[PDB]
Write a protein that binds this DNA or RNA. Sequence first.
RNA 1: AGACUCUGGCAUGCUAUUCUUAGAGGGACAAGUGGCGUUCAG
Lengths: 951, 52, 297, 81
Amino acid sequence: AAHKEICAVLAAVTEVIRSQGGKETETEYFAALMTTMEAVESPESLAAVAYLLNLVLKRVPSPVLIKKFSDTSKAFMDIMSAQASSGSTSVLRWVLSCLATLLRKQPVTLQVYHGLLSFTVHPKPKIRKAAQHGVCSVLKGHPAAISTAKFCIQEIEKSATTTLHMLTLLKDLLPCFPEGLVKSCSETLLRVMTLSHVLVTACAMQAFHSLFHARPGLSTLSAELNAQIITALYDYVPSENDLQPLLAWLKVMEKAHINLVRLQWDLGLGHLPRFFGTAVTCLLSPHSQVLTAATQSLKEILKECVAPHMADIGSVTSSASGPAQSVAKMFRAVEEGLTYKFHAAWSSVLQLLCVFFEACGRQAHPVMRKCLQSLCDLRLSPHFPHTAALDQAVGAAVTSMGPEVVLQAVPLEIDGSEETLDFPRSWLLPVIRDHVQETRLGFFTTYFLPLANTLKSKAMDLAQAGSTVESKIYDTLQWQMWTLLPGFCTRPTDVAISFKGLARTLGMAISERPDLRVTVCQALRTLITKGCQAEADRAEVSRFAKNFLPILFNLYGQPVAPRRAVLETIRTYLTITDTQLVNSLLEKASEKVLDPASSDFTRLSVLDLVVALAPCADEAAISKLYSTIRPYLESKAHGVQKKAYRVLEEVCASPQGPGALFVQSHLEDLKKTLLDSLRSTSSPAKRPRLKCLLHIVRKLSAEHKEFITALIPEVILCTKEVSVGARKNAFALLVEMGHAFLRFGSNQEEALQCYLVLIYPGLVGAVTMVSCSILALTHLLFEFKGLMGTSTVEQLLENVCLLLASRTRDVVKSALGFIKVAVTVMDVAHLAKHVQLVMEAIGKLSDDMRRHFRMKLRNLFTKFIRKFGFELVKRLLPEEYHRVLVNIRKAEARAKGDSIEEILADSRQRSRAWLKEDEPLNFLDPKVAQRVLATQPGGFKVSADGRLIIR
Amino acid sequence: RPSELSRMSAAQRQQLLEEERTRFQELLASPAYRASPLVAIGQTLARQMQLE
Amino acid sequence: AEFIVGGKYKLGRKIGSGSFGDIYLATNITNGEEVAVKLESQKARHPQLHYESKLYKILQGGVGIPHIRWYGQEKDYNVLVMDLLGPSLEDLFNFCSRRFTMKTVLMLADQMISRIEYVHTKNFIHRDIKPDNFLMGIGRHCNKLFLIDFGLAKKYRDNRTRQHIPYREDKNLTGTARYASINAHLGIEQSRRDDMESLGYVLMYFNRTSLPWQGLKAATKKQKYEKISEKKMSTPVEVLCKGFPAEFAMYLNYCRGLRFEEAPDYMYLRQLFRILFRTLNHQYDYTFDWTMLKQKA
Amino acid sequence: RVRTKTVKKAARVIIEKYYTRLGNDFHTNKRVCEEIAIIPSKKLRNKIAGYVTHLMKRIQRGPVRGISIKLQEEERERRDN
RNA sequence: AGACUCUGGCAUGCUAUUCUUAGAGGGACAAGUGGCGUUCAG
């Protein structure tokens, strides 16, 4: 009862009692309480003053401590000797703690440190733990490290349960030791590793983990010492499958290798192949946890210790000498880790090979090919579960190099005329499509142009030959290798010289080859989206853009086709081109629109081209186009007005450039035109127009309040427009006009009050515009939450209560939405004044309105029960609602890969293997793993016409 | 004159927009709606609903 | 609604603050009778409400003690709910524009003598006697005084072995120093003698309507209490009741000279008070100053 | 929007029956759903066409060996009758 | 925090028919794009 009090020693003694006499701190308290410390052994009085001394002693009387450190050392030392002769715990524990504080703050000091250190082996846990933590705080808060290291060495050599205790000391204190003492400590630690006791082994592996995890400097640990302790630690490797000490052995060897690489990288990479070979051998253990740990450790070493030095190492071949030869050796180890003897870790081995590819491939490709051929052979097994992982690995290797080196290693056997129909390496084309990102385009030209052309010719020739089965297969093939162009267009290294060889080919393939067009368009977009980083590349793209523009315009403007992908390609492709030919094509498109001999579909297509060309032109062409399009805002055709408003939105969309200059030059003209064309705007044309108004609200000057207050009713009636996009644009425009009035005055709250009283009268007139203004206030209440002033919100809420009595369902629904938003937003302390009125208006709603709007009333009652008492809501509702309430309360009681067959699916254990028995099974054959599997081998009513019946 | 805007014609949309714009202009030019806006709104709503 | 105590009492508004809690009003939802609420926080500096419950259930039956209604623990608090009572004596002191008459103070003196008789026959001391601590009844209890707030109460005698708490010096001033005793000021263990010395102090507070050490200011609380102490020894007994009957003076002299283990004759004090009451020719008609200003309105 | 069990079941069986005669876009799929299936509901016809279009845009991105062996298996079944 | 049933906007189309009709047939299926996504559900 009296420890939890604020006045107790728990809180206030730590704060205000340290200020002794008004100034913190004075040891005159301690200088007066020597008389209790001497010749008095009363329990619970020495312990309490020792507790207070320990608590107050941390508040830095440091020069006084340096002065009377001799007096304190003698006093607490005689206390130590007397209490050791007597044998108490609490007084001894807090005198250990306060001596620890004194030694942390500050010849005889070595004696005090020895006296503090000698009580670690004291058998009582409270004494031992306090002494250990005090020694750790003193050393980490050093000239005394040699003495305590020698003390730990002699204490180990003297001794069996205390061995674990100063091993805990070693675990907590190894980083703060000198190098020779670290060497002697590790020699003694391996001496106690000569014993077969398990707990000492686990604790001293934890000591190694704490030693290597802290990443010590050169003074604490040298590289030669790290290499020696790494070579010494190889002698234990407990058996194969112990999984408690093998985990620690792998972890400390990982940390030691990381520290060795951090000190001297070449020696660390030189010592890595032995550890990688032992890890690959340890991957044959039947335990899954050690397999995951070995995979994670080798992945960490590959990512942090192997990857960043490969620019220094360079390319490795079969005749490497330095660290490159070590990289080749540990690659040889991970390649040997792919044989038939594993057959259960192939998921982990393939994942680690995948990160190996990603880290290593660009310099390790000359030796990389045999592993690629072997893993290609592994997919030829009848039943493979790691097909997705194998495809990820092949994609990682392709991402490392590209298809040229891979096809040198594993060639495609679809080169022209084949005999059978079962392509064994057909997964390579999806892999190449999914994972080519850093290749050269010239290889794509010189390999995939003639091969795909010959396969397309063969497909067509077999199509006229009657065989419609093989022709479809070859057409799907040529489609698949024509989808590699977006992959090749990701980040090419020679797109400044190889794009000249594909311009006319891509033009004809987008002109008279529809079956590729979308992908071709995507390829163009993909290229642009990440390929115009350099300037010569963008110059080449413009130099062929001047030819590609008529082709794309004629493709989009033709009658019927993937017009929308062509339009997106045109949009980006015109954002990356020069302005003069944009002006020329804008003039030609204006000529085509103004030509009366054009059809309506052609006119709309050229208007879409005008929309695309509008933001990319200069200010004079934009002004001329705006003058041409300005009479079209009153056209009776909804499509023409929609395209006109889209043009006006697109020219106002650019925040900088000729569009912004045109807006600044023609703001008054645009304002009077948009105010004049407000009366004759069609329903689809509301959707872009608001956005255009949006684009002229963001940069509107202070002398424009009349324009906004004239636009307001249109924006509200568009918040209840038919189109969801128009409603979204109107809500965004209301928010943006609210933001625009936050810039015209000094007081934000008064400006928001003005904006609200400019939109308030909509609660007065017709029913649909009343619901319009309720929805507008509902949207605005969620955005400017406290800024209008909650009391005004309360008044608005009261008004909504009157609108809760409306006959029309739309007004009631909008009022319920406003009530939900108000409950969410404004404060519960101000809700509690207004719960009764709003929920009384809820209560006398109707029978029909209550029955129809049961979801919203249920959610509102749930929110009110969450925010207030359940008994209050029960008291103020009428009878029937109470039923729903208890259900709500019961509710609150209850609240506390790409194959055909896999896609067409009706949607200890992993170590199992199946042999197969043909020639006799030669286990020593390099191609034996193909015959060792990892998985188990092996409705409607048709009518008389034959058509199926679906119901 | 249906309340739902999705089922009713665009000419009547224009007529309703013009009528509500004129009503907004008249209510904004009214001296009663210059000193106590929300009080006048509450009185008008109370009158309109006691009519109903 | 927002909070229900006991399952059948609905809480109302605050009426005051106790020594170890806050005082609220509540209405019973079953029958409609009105009760008073003492609420305290379950984690605080003084968890003494269960001792208060024990002292209230000890003091039941006799006159001048409100009857116990309920006690319990409510989700962050401990709440003890009692019968409703009226204002304290200081509220009537404020309402009467700071003036008391001879008849009214002898009514109050007889009532507090009876209260002190009851509490020392129930083997407990108060140690925080003040006009705020004595409440007035309601309804037919409108002529009966009531004693509350056993928070600072303690045991002063044993039922079996007839032994007092042993005397020992240096006791902190638990109650208020406006009516604390000289023995309470020094640190002498408080007994019944200090209790009716505090009764004499509140009596002279009611008579003189002011204290010479009221509103005294010093360096700190301890210095204030000490200064009040030596100016209390510096004040003669007879000068405190100049122009007044000597009954109060020799009452103070009698209660000052009482020993520790003695048993005072309270019948003697009641006899002397009623002799003075009948020699000034008044009758027990219960017509108090607050009552007559209610009928005057 | 979510898709019911009968739509995906009928789509899977219609793939397994007539993958050969299908197309790649919503037009050809709704046409072959008109001329292959009875499908009295136009709503369910649009749903089945959309989901078989989703199946098409999923499955020609896979390896061609499975689709190829499906073609000669379907050709063998058709030639058998 | 309704994956229940039916269903509207547009037809210068068929039916006695571009302005009024009332039967049928179309049209919308998340169909297309870009990001986030277990790379598939969303």
